[PDB]
Design a protein around this ligand. Sequence first.
Ligand SMILES: *Cc1cc2c(cc1C)nc1c(=O)[nH]c(=O)nc-1n2C[C@H](O)[C@H](O)[C@H](O)COP(=O)(O)OP(=O)(O)OC[C@H]1O[C@@H](n2cnc3c(N)ncnc32)[C@H](O)[C@@H]1O
Length: 430
Amino acid sequence: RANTKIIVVGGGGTMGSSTALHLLRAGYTPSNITVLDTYPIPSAQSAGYDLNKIFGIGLRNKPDLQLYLEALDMWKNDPLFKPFFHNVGQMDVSSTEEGIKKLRMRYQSLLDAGIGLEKTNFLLESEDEILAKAPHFTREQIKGWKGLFCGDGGWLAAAKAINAIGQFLKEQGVKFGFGEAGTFKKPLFADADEKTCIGVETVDGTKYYADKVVLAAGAWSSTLVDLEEQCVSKAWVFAHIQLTPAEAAAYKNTPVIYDGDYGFFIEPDENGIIKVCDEFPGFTHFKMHQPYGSPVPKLISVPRSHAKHPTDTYPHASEVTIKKAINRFLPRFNDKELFNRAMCWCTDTADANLLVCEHPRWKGFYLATGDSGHSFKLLPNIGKHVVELLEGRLESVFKDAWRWRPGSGDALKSRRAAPAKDLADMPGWR
Ligand SMILES: *Cc1cc2c(cc1C)nc1c(=O)[nH]c(=O)nc-1n2C[C@H](O)[C@H](O)[C@H](O)COP(=O)(O)OP(=O)(O)OC[C@H]1O[C@@H](n2cnc3c(N)ncnc32)[C@H](O)[C@@H]1O
């Protein structure tokens, strides 16, 4: 480990920073690790560059249970990550027939895991029970609502946690490249047959050589190399509203509130800011782009970066749905002004499992992407398994789920309600 050189492409991001962290913990020599990201860690265009994220339980795919438990343990006990986890719990709510059904079935799925999750997860069938966990609601507001309360979760101070990894990496003497000298252009090969990767070249022409390369470029991964449409990148949206300390006080330590027909909000941070998201299948930004491995040009959804273009917001349609979420959850704040309107990018696989594997042809080159919009929670632990993969030690439960799988389904729809619409058809964000 001490004599192996690793390049982590996108190391200023969620899966990338986690990987560089666990390389250091595993005893890799800091000077042998090179983080290449367009932006310095925490990357300003990273999906994890956010006031907060939700930490919650999900049992959709096979490794999800173990990954979640693994992450929880670390969010609660790892001194590096512990300050950034706010265990206020989460309550999912609904008042529709289909919505309440989904809540009940979800609850039952937790039980069917058979590990005792009913001890920290509760079905709330009455108004009183809902108001008890979320005193800021009014009784009239929640008429007909049912709730599912998960006591294990809460929210995460996202950018702060990635910055915490970054501080450590830099203290340790990890090598960095940012800007054009940090922006992956193509991999380097020993022979023209392309079967042995020996490094990467960035868009400025700078070459970096290493034993192994990890591609953790999030929503950009599919643009940089050909993933054969395994990964379709999509934008989700959020707005902010600012509360006074007096307005914020009713929401202190209140659970994350979610409703699948509206979206979610998180309690005001130390500055009185509430972030609100809607729920929708996402937006693509289609372009032709020549990834490598294609390397002919190919239509791929390419992120329109808010970091490189701060004057971008979100479509008009998103303004509507975000305001509906605010009316649903926070009607007393309907006249609050929305601001820091922005788009946040992820990349979906067909089955919403990760794409974490060695490239089929380019040995030495490893993919660590396919976050599918639900992987910030895995910040503390995902790097441990990326390292296991590098070392040939990744267990089958993860390896099989994360394997190279082109043609395994339509990633444009993925596991969501619909194929994503494209930003070219949604006016207002420019
Ligand atoms: C968008 C979004 C996502 C999200 C969320 C809400 C929104 C609005 N809420 C979540 C939640 O409540 N709970 C949760 O678990 N996840 C939530 N998410 C998803 C989460 O943000 C993403 O799953 C995760 O952050 C993605 O990580 P990933 O590592 O995959 O992506 P990234 O963090 O963006 O990192 C990518 C890095 O790559 C760098 N980059 C890009 N191009 C290059 C090149 N060419 N060379 C080098 N680096 C490159 C980017 O800069 C970035 O740093």
